[PDB]
Amino acid sequence: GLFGAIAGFIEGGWTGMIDGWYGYHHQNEQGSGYAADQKSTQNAINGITNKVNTVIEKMNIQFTAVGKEFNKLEKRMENLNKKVDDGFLDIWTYNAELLVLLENERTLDFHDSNVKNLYEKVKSQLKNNAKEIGNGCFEFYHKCDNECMESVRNGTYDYPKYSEESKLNRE
């Protein structure tokens, strides 16, 4: 994708995370589990629901539209009516297919951006207290319990609390 996260440095998705589009997987002495980031998922849902509604609202309802009849001496008028009907159908088919293609590309890039931004938020919090092991995973240089993991997930990670221990194990 444009932001390099989905199908990029994060190779695959998580079937085990069913509660959201983006989230975290943790592993410490207390166990393991998946936790969706509710803030980013809900914000994305609102944006995407906005996009689909905008596409539907932009297309007015088609009210009654039937054909006309012409006698054998009105061929020019009949062909003009056909040219109008065919021309409008050409444009609306064109507009509809292109709008979906264009918005589909942006939607996938939008999801790619959210994953990258979420990744950078964690990386900017941990700093040198952890190391990038690839695949979007961080290995802590200190013990990180469930309360410590929750602090990373909600953006309140206490970096000074673990700096001394991390530096020792970072050696």
Binding site: H25, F63, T107
Partner: protein, 321 residues
Amino acid sequence: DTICIGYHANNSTDTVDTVLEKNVTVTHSVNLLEDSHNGKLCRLKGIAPLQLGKCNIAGWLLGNPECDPLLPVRSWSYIVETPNSENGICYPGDFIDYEELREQLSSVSSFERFEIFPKESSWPNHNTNGVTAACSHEGKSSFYRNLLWLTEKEGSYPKLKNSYVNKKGKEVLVLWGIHHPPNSKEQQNLYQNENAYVSVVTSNYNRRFTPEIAERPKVRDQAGRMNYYWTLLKPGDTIIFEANGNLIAPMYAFALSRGFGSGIITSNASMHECNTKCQTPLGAINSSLPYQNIHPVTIGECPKYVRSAKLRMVTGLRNIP
């Protein structure tokens, strides 16, 4: 201890297309293209359509005797013609401004069929019993139910003069015909005058008709012709008929009510006890989707017709389990 950033995946096999890539499998998606219909003719916003059966518009308005007679008053939301309407005009000729009349009927929501010139009161000095084998009924010669073939009575065709004042409060559609015999011997036999004429006048209509006699190729075994004419009589206006021959006089007229969103369609589907907001000649559509690919002809509140086979917008992510 580790923490990882990741994204959702599932068992979805839905695919979408983008400008850069096709057949992208995605976790969630929304279809925007309606492709399903019920295959039936339904009531539209609670009002049933007017089905003409074996008749087309011309046959119903003139009163072709081969179609089942309708009730005196009908109200509808759209008009259905069958694709193989064999019953139309039965005596050959020209229906003047027929397509314009069809366009007028596309905005009509109700009619009342009433006797404009009563059969046994309006023409005491003329014969009104004329029938033809072209407009047969039950194997017998007949004629249009809404028109009357006036001919000579006791060897004479007096100059007739009749009028009607529109007191219905709605437009009144009046139809009549002009007969053109194939030779002068028949013209004298039926109408007793060779230089005959027909005059029809209202406040905004003024036309004079004259027979044009010649031998013609047989159409429905008739070398004669009948030309059909119509006009919309405004509320409060008078129409006057004057003729000394060849007039196919009106007997029944239609008081018309104007409506919105109606139209005429051709369909072989059957009427069912159903209600819809959107009707196509193939069937009814129950959908809130913005597009459909079922039929370009639509009545009611309908999705926009497009030629596309697929219109799917991704809502979720690329699916990589």
